[PDB]
Structures are given as structure tokens and as C-alpha cells.
Design a protein around this ligand. Sequence first.
Ligand SMILES: [Xe]
Ligand SMILES: [Xe]
Ligand SMILES: [Xe]
Ligand SMILES: [Xe]
Ligand SMILES: [Xe]
Ligand SMILES: [Xe]
Ligand SMILES: [Xe]
Lengths: 185, 185
Amino acid sequence: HHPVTPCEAPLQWEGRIVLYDHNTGKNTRATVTYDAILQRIRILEEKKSFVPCKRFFEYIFLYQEAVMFQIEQVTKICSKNTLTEPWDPYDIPENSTYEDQYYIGGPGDQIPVQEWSDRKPARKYETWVGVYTVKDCYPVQETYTKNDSMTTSTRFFDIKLGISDPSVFNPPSTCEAAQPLLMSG
Amino acid sequence: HHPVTPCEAPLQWEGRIVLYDHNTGKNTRATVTYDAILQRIRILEEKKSFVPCKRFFEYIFLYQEAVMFQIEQVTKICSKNTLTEPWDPYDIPENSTYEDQYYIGGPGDQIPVQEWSDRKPARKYETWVGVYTVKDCYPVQETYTKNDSMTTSTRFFDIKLGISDPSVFNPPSTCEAAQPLLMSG
Ligand SMILES: [Xe]
Ligand SMILES: [Xe]
Ligand SMILES: [Xe]
Ligand SMILES: [Xe]
Ligand SMILES: [Xe]
Ligand SMILES: [Xe]
Ligand SMILES: [Xe]
């Protein structure tokens, strides 16, 4: 029985992701503190042994106040910018096309999930697909070929409901500053 | 404790996948019958309501006999071709760099998995990443940015150990034929 609407994804959680940007072939790894109630999300990039990028950023997105802070974790050199952009939660729009349900993982230790997309018969390809657990409606994976081939796959994990540490949305001392554009060296 | 070697993935199973080709933005959906012992894999593309592609193929890959059959499921018009290519199982090479372990899905209904890649500090980006379950070492997802930006993400599910139906590797009557190149209309 094809669901009449998608489950409603959690509004607040702390978890970790891997964002795979195809444009560049890069996997960023991140710890994420997510809050759809306040329309704010904090992403702390993660470092691994013997990677060639010198630079790692914490991002703090505050859509309610239309600004994003971006801190180089090493130098601490902040970067306040504006956000023109409308907030996009990690959930499933109510107009989303159901696609499938299946069990991930082998017999015994497995788990049922669901696949939705923005497929409509008008267009050749989808621009969104998401997989979410059946029980709690947690995000597992999304792909968003947004803006003509700037496509990303995102994987979510170690999710844990709610927010133990709200301090992390408070931008640090060094953030009474300006609008640089930082990227990875 | 960083694993000294990766678990050994199953050699035979019947499951289903979604292959996301970025070049084109297309998700193919498929049923798969996989056998690393005989180095052969049969992929039966799957149809959904109100997609705009008219054409759907069953592929039968027989690496031990260096040939691939390709059947249009509608017209039945076969297409035997040669395979120059070395077989690549769905597993984790023993020289693979461990990356992480984490739980997919929310509290209660979740499942531990593992992430490996072909990262070495010599090269900026990975060209392979795979996620596999911890218990049974089942494939969950891979991304293989092979050959300079011909990158794919693959998701695996409804996997079930072993092969109930070996008939499917036997090419049909209409396959005493030749080497067309078929693609989707
Ligand atoms: Xe979203
Ligand atoms: Xe997509
Ligand atoms: Xe996805
Ligand atoms: Xe991708
Ligand atoms: Xe592989
Ligand atoms: Xe990759
Ligand atoms: Xe992956």
C-alpha cells in the first residue's frame, strides 16, 4: 500500500555525514548539529590522517537571522556572510513521489527504509532522491543533482535525537568580523 | 582498533540495486544475481510507472567466457559482445584504507556498517569508497569515480544469500546472434 504521505522526519538531531560533491570528486566528512525548528545548522568538518588539505572549517548557518558564520578551525579567522537562500530541511516534501521500500543489510542485522524522489513524468531525470528509515523516519542518504549538474550524494549516520550542546550555535569571540571567502588548501 | 584486514564479502547473492550515473543524472533500478565464484553477474533493469524511457534491458555478464549478453526485454532482440575487462567483485580489496564505522538509522532500529576506500596520501581524491555491514559484510553502497569523472553511486538492498534460480544465466533462444549496441529511448 503506497503511502498517502511521507513520514515526518526529525526536527532536531546531532549526527555525522559524508557529503560527496561530484563537481570536484571530494568527500567532505562532517559532524552536524541540525535544528529545523530554529532553521539553523552547524557543520564541523572532520580531519583524517594524512589528507593533503591544510584547511578545515566549522560552519554555522542561521537562517532566521539570514547569516552564515564560517570559522577556519586552525587560524580561527571567522567570516560572517549573508544568506539570501530559503532554508531546506532534511526531510521529504509532502509532494514527493514514493519510489520503493527495502531492507538494507543482510539477514538478521538489517533495517527497513524507504525511497522517495521528486520524479514527475514531465521530466527525464530526478533532481532529488532520499532514503529514510521506516520506523523513525531518519535520513540515511540523499542525492540532489541541483542546478544543472552540481550534484551531491550525502550519507547520514550516528544520528541521535535532539541537541545536547546548544553552545555550538554561538559564534566565537573572533566573529565580530567580515565576509571573506574561505576554501581548502 | 583499526582492522588489520577488511571482512570478506559474500560471493553469491540475489539482490536489487540502484545505480546512479552522474555523467547523465540517471538512476537505473535493477534486480541483480551475483556470483563471484563463476565471475558472472546478471542485471535485470526494472520499470516504473510513467517513466519516459521506452527500452529496458536484461544483461548477462559471463567473464569466464569473455562475453556479455544484452537482451531488450520487450523486443527480445539479443546482443552478444566480448568482454576485454577484468572482473571486479563487489567487495573490499585487501589493500583498502579503513575510514570509519558507524550506525545507520535511528535508535532501536539501526545497524552497524563500515566504510573503506582506496585513499592513499599520494592522491587528492579517492576513486573508490564502499560501505559494508559489520556482521555479514554485505554491500550497502559504493561510489567509484572511475576514469576521470565517470562516477557512479550504487546502493544495494533486499540482498539474500545464494542463488535460488540459476536458469537466469542461460541466455535465451534469441541469443545465437551478434553485437548490436543498445541504449534507452
Ligand atoms: Xe531537503
Ligand atoms: Xe538525483
Ligand atoms: Xe539517494
Ligand atoms: Xe554522484
Ligand atoms: Xe569492487
Ligand atoms: Xe569516489
Ligand atoms: Xe559510498
